[PDB]
Design a protein around this nucleic acid. Structure first.
Ligand code: MG
Ligand code: MG
Ligand code: MG
Ligand code: MG
Ligand code: MG
Ligand code: MG
Ligand code: MG
Lengths: 322, 321, 322, 332
DNA sequence: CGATAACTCGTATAA
DNA sequence: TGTATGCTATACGAAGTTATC
DNA sequence: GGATAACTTCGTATAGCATACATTATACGAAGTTATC
DNA sequence: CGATAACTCGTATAA
DNA sequence: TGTATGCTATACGAAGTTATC
DNA sequence: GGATAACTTCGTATAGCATACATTATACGAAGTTATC
């Protein structure tokens, strides 16, 4: 069609309207839908309802996670709607098998995993264990954790903090100003305040590294084997790295992780996030207050992030034991 | 013509719904059809004008609002899954439905909920049944101890099975809740019996000896003698477990009226409702509660504790200062 | 047209799918529109932009309130859309004129009046002054006024309260149950609980009048010259009545409604709502707690119910004088 | 008024509609027409300079144009303003609007993102809090210059009532009444909305009254009740009452600028906005003072006329009373 | 009986 | 009274006015 | 005549909000209507 | 001059 | 990462069952 | 033999609760890169 090739053409020219992470996944599900589609002798676009339904099932057979099967059907979907042609999920065949796959796989004993938690308990420990270090590497990481725990920001949002983004409350606490996050991109921003405790842990790392040199510097940066922080203002620390700072401080206190190859065996990016999220509910904070700390818009999600207490647990058990 | 194809695919993957949905899908299609041949109307495809006369009918028969909607609901799905117009996209249907809802709620119809099986009740049922011996009066006190200690649905309480059970060095059981019923389980992946409730559950495990095979289901049938008949193929039915509540409630307040009101005696939910209500009384924050049960909206939990003294209101607090 | 005679029919057919006063007012408008339409030689249906406009213009001349003209324009649009036609407020002309008529009025001086407040301080007065009487109607009127300011319910709702609707908390506080209000209609409904002191003034009138001999008995009912009750289950006390009860009680203390033809010169239906709303505001109750105490689902209405403290006022004044 | 809805360009009924919108012009705010005209004017010149057709607008061009503004360095709220007016021009004349088409829509979304990442961020008024009133008051309360007396009256009334500046330049004497307590009370007719969410009267404190009464008896504005409360004052320190001409908003914004220039000195040399008090400084200030002294968000919002928490919060966001919950936990 | 306390209708305006 | 982005103010540098130094 | 305090007007850049939609309630003086007195 | 500390990319899966 | 509404699950009188009493 | 106790299985009437839609982000092992030891 003329129109379909213009709609598509329109999109690529403004591809940056979408998240780079969206492109990465569109191209991956695309080349993966193309491969199969070829080694089966089928047309890959516009996608025929029946052929996709098949594909989805091959993905079930491959033993892939539900949510991965989704994302695939999902990117095939955007690719179309954006082209202005009806989507695969617009046919009963795709629409249903998808639910089936979501049903079958659920009972086979499959649910969604979620990051190991990094709670206050753990903060106090790691803090007191590296509180007294004098090394740049440590001084930093003990500041990256306090922020992550206190502000509940995602790791990417943190890699982005620039020094000119920090200001102070009158009483002393710090204030980071966050602009773009996973679900809000505006000029009004939002101010996430650290505490007095963490404020000092950032402060120590600020001087000990020297980044307050150019306000346009990113607050966090590399520290090479020689122990010297190498500030910058064009390249930020990869998320892969902050992810690393987690794994490490757990391969510190508890060393070597399993040979299971299972996911979330040690701390990762979301840990502090789900961590504080727990400690709050447990401390009895209101629903709205938890929503602000997290940056969530509805009970629906806050509610998700809770899997809660276990050992003796809490709630009922604490109630039964008079 | 084409619809017949949609219909076959609609079936090819019948797996896409709960066995429990199909039941009502047929149960209603059955009823709709019955009404059609008796008044002279084609039951499929449905024509608004007709559906409307049918809906206004279920009102007369006295069926409650929330039901008329399940009828209408089901009808819709039947047409949508077939390239066809639902009946609710028609101007006449949606028009009467509003008529009916306002007419019924106005005529004084009301929605009810389970009778609450609070702690006060678990304590009074623990006594007279505590020092029993009968291989049943044991299984019953253990099932109840669980229903209140986990706000697990009666259906999940069936599927539980030995393997699933394990222990915490605290000395309290901890039922692994494998095979949830939602991809993202807002309820845990591990419920944990208290201290007493554990002990009470152990008793029934030895006596019944479901223990042997781990695939066996924790609870089971118990014949007129007083002996457990373990098994790992058939689970102790939903109906069964409901009755267990029905009994205990008959054993303390006699039997039901002559009337037909529902919730005249504890049923499956009784457990949760009580649990909820009590945590409220204590001081547990709504999120903790919402989580302990496994809830996601919040109205439903407020629905339960709406009549406590704490959740009275702000004007009250203002008048009593 | 042919269809339009159907749509209009279906409509009149299940006319019970709309409120009483919706239809009441719909006709009343077509009866003003049809009028002006005859005497001016203009078709009345389908209404032509210009015509509607000339009319909306007329009403502004006849001195009507913005809010009123808006009702006329509104009813006119329901009839057209509900019958399958484009709305007259769909034409660049009707809408711009409607927007103009407001702007001009507001910019002149017009503003929207609101019920005279019946604060917590008006309760206490009306109480020690009727608290001791033994009359059959002074006992009623004081419960109503109690349930009114205490529950915030709208009079039409109050009228509908049947005895089988009341239940009790263990603390012993009546707890009325409403199911149909201006904003929502369902089987779930909400449960307004009364204070202790006020649940008492009800436990009274229930007895003294004994409307409690048949459940399906409206908690509130007429009194007669002789001071005798008069229960029912097929006749609710008139809303027009409850509006009276307020005036009366206002007379009782402030004399006679001065003659100025103006509205809100003495207590009326909403006087309890605006009242309570304002007291809570002052007292310092939160937004989500006020919203709930009045059946509102959004900050922008609670806010709409306030035109706070006069004279020495509050806030800024209190703030500067301290 | 408009650019030049063409002899052959404005084709058909876009002429009908357009005529209509102009017939009922009083339907939009004066300040709205000002922008609409200003945007067409501005789009029109880029179209001449760049050789494009100015109306109806073609997407591919509106897009090239929005990417231009971005480059000129304009802000995102400014670019949406341009797109917005252009949209009305079209919709209010019958044609299908820009950003009703894939290209404009997408570009716009892209412009927004890019800009935020370059860390562009909104500024708000510099607060005129209560400790500023006090400092500014302990200084000009000893002056007898008639100007000063006027200004101090204004600053007082401004902080005390949280009224917009345009709203103040309309308060006319006949509007000032008295309270049994001896403190003025300003009725505020000619409000801003059918439903005046802020009130129908504002009461001045006892002290802010002493401050306004001394301007009233030195200017002589009482001579004619219809007179505006505030007015000019010339080279010679002499008042000049009127009932037809109100003081401009520009001038009130000037009283704020100068009152800041007085205490803190000449203004910094960059071109940044909000480097000295402006018309919103008091509303913003008062908002913070109320928060700091424990006042319910409803009570605050009504004091200002706000109706959307999202705003009065953007003022008191960096207060300590709002540091959040995770800070309360971490802090034993 | 007729005079009265105590209570359906249309238009205007707020929720 | 609840659900849908689009109108409507202020910011401020600079140029144009008008009565007093 | 000029120079100049103190404005008013302008025009473009940006912050701050406010209403259309689609019903559903109340306000209130006037008739109309029961059972008491 | 290696050896080593400390940091792109493709698929899978959560938010 | 959020939610109106479209699927899921319990309620329960009553009929079949299958081992004990 | 005949009468339960204790259950399964039904069908319809009602409560309860959670998803499709459209992006945007994190998990993590392997491979690559650059100062420094
Ligand atoms: Mg999907
Ligand atoms: Mg302007
Ligand atoms: Mg200051
Ligand atoms: Mg000045
Ligand atoms: Mg300053
Ligand atoms: Mg000058
Ligand atoms: Mg994949």
């Amino acid at each position: 069609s003329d129109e379909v090739r213009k709609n598509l053409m329109d999109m690529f020219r403004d591809r940056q309207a979408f998240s780079e992470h969206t492109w990465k996944m569109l191209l991956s599900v695309c080349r993966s839908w193309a491969a199969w589609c070829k080694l089966n002798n089928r047309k890959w676009f516009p996608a025929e309802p029946e052929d996709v339904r098949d594909y989805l099932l091959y993905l079930q057979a491959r033993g892939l996670a539900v949510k991965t099967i989704q994302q695939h059907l999902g990117q095939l979907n955007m690719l179309h709607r954006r082209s202005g042609l009806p989507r695969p999920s617009d046919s009963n065949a795709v629409s249903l098998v998808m639910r089936r796959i979501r049903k079958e796989n659920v009972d086979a004993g499959e649910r969604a995993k979620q990051a190991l938690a990094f709670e206050r308990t753990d903060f106090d420990q790691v803090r007191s264990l590296m509180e007294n270090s004098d090394r740049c590497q440590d001084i930093r990481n003990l500041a990256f954790l306090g922020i992550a725990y206190n502000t509940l920001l995602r790791i990417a949002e943190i890699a982005r903090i620039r020094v000119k983004d920090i200001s102070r409350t009158d009483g002393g606490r710090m204030l980071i100003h966050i602009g773009r996050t996973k679900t809000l991109v505006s000029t009004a921003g939002v101010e996430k305040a650290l505490s007095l405790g963490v404020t000092k842990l950032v402060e120590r790392w600020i001087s000990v590294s020297g980044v307050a040199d150019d306000p346009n510097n990113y607050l966090f940066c590399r520290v090479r084997k020689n122990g010297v922080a190498a500030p910058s203002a064009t390249s930020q620390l990869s998320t892969r790295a902050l992810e690393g700072i987690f794994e490490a401080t757990h391969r510190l206190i508890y060393g070597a992780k399993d040979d299971s190859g299972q996911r979330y065996l040690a701390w990762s990016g979301h840990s502090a996030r789900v961590g504080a999220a727990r400690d709050m509910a447990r401390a009895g904070v209101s629903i709205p207050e938890i929503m602000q700390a997290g940056g969530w818009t509805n009970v629906n999600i806050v509610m998700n992030y809770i899997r809660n207490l276990d050992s003796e647990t809490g709630a009922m058990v604490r109630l039964l034991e008079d």
